[PDB]
Design a binder for this molecule. Structure first.
Ligand SMILES: [Fe+3]
Length: 392
């Protein structure tokens, strides 16, 4: 197997305190640059945006990033236990008396996030600064040979902040807000093989949904070297694909029948409102649109196992442009146990479909071939496309 991601991704999961320190600083630089893009569009108006289920207010997101970090580092009396931390132990107070009432994504009702008496953008930035200074001071106590358990929460809060940065990017694109921050097609042979799927014990940090690592059989197939381009996608649309319900699943038909425009999201072709680049990865497609293109092409989505296997074994397999829908429902691997952030994976099994890879807005520190992204199969706001495969 190849390495599962860029050096930053390996360093954050497996590196020493100095690596996790550099990752926390890089995550915060990215968070504040995105906060600045939002400030340019919304001028620190709270809430700053209308309500939708796929959104949160930008100043709520910033306070939530600080709250999460503080919850799992400075207030956490069992950091050294890593995944054996008792999630509901008695914690020190927050810097902010109402932090738990405002920012705990497990406690605060979604619509309520538009109607909280939050601190202003300046005070929210002050809370971020104070919490990070506390986190880094505690990290600087760890020795260079610190165990995975000792580093566990520092790695977890860096990855969480990466996730919220990407969310800022896809929410910005949804709100039409501008931020500062394909090659030739080919088909690859994936031979019959055994994949050790997921994250092995002592490879460093693993998300709970990556465990247990377990051997799976991979059937021989032929797989796209890169995500499906607009050039490869649009011939399905021009062949009447969004008016032939027979290409679609039952869930897809129900989705399709409920659509005003019988063509992709953000395509008027133009996009966003600039002209459409056929060489760009098809993006803002849901699972139903990806599967219907597959049936039309006589191809299919990979399973996440086929995807992971290809990503780790085939040097011509190029990813990281768009998240890629798999055929795999988000379900536990054998031996799954929720980690101390209990609600990260476990509540979302069944109702979510797995996407693999990463998109242009994913942090280099998060983007990883074992990482399981999970969204309801209708979602289009995410930077999602797909690749296709078929029998050998
Ligand atoms: Fe969060």
């Amino acid at each position: 197997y190849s390495v599962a991601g860029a050096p930053e991704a390996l360093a954050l999961r497996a590196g020493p305190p100095a690596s996790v320190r550099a990752a926390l600083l890089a995550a915060r630089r990215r968070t504040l640059d995105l906060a600045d893009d939002f400030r340019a569009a919304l001028g620190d108006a709270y809430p700053g945006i209308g309500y939708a289920p796929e959104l949160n207010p930008p100043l709520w997101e910033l306070g939530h990033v600080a709250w999460f970090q503080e919850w799992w580092i400075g207030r956490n009396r069992q950091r050294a236990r890593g995944v054996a931390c008792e999630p509901d132990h008695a914690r020190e107070p927050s810097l902010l008396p109402q932090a738990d009432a405002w920012y705990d994504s497990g406690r605060v009702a979604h619509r309520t996030r538009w109607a909280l008496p939050l601190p202003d953008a300046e005070a929210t930035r002050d809370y971020l600064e104070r919490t990070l200074a506390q986190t880094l001071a505690l990290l600087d106590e760890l020795p260079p040979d610190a165990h995975d358990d000792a580093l566990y929460f520092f790695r977890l809060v860096a990855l969480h902040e990466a996730m919220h940065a990407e969310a800022a990017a896809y929410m910005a694109e949804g709100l039409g807000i501008a931020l500062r921050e394909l090659a030739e097609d080919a088909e690859l042979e994936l031979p019959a093989q055994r994949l050790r799927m997921g994250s092995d014990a002592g490879t460093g940090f693993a998300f709970d949904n990556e465990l247990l690592s377990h051997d799976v059989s991979i059937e021989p197939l032929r797989i796209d070297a890169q995500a499906v381009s607009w050039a490869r996608f649009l011939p399905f649309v021009e062949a009447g694909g969004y008016e032939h319900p027979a290409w679609w699943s039952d869930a897809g038909r129900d989705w399709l029948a409920r659509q005003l425009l019988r063509h992709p999201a953000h395509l008027r072709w133009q996009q966003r409102w600039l002209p459409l680049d056929p060489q760009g990865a098809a993006v803002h497609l849901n699972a139903h649109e990806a599967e219907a293109w597959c049936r039309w092409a006589g191809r299919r989505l990979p399973t996440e196992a086929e995807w992971e296997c290809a990503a780790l074994t085939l040097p011509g397999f190029a990813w990281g442009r768009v998240w890629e829908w798999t055929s795999s429902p988000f379900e536990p691997y054998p031996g799954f146990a929720p980690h101390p952030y209990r609600d990260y994976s476990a509540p979302w099994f069944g109702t979510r479909r797995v996407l693999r890879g990463a998109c242009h807005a994913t942090s280099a520190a998060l983007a990883h071939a074992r990482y399981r992204n999970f969204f309801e199969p209708h979602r289009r706001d995410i930077f999602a496309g797909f690749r296709s495969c078929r029998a050998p």
